Amino acid sequence: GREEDPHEGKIWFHGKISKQEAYNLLMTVGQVSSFLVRPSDNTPGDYSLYFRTNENIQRFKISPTPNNQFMMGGRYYNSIGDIIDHYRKEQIVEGYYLKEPVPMQ
């Protein structure tokens, strides 16, 4: 059978939407400072953190390691959940923190 992504069931993880569908969710379900994570289209094995500012949606690359850690913003983290915890408490863009996930609908 087909294996699901290890992050399936995380509130912020969307395994089967397109990039534009993620944007649409952030603009309709989400509010400013909402976020979600999906697998990268262009780099197999990577993830993308999508984040809504007042003017646009920004994407941040998350690159896993062979030992199942995750590189983001030049720094390694034990999990994607730890990246999210970090940027709820320290700004991800000037003036902005992560606030609410967009849940899988």
Domains of the chain: 6-89 (3.30.505.10)
**Strand, helix or coil for residue 101:** strand
Method: X-ray
Tell me the structure's resolution in angstroms, rounded to a single decimal: 1.5
Taking CA atoms, 98 is separated from 12, 24, 38, 60, in Å, by 12, 18, 16, 12
Say if residues 64 and 23 touch (Cβ distance below 8 Å). Answer: no
Rounded Cα distance between 38 and 12, Å, is 9
Which residues lie closer than 8 Å to 46 by C-beta, 6 or more apart? Answer: 39, 40, 61, 62, 63, 64
Total length of the chain:
105
> What is the residue-wise DSSP string for 68-94?
S-EEETTEEES-HHHHHHHHHHS-SBT
> Partners of 46 in the beta sheet?
none
- Cβ neighbourhood burial of 36 (10 Å; 0-12, 13-18, 19+): buried
Rounded Cα distance between 16 and 87, Å, is 25
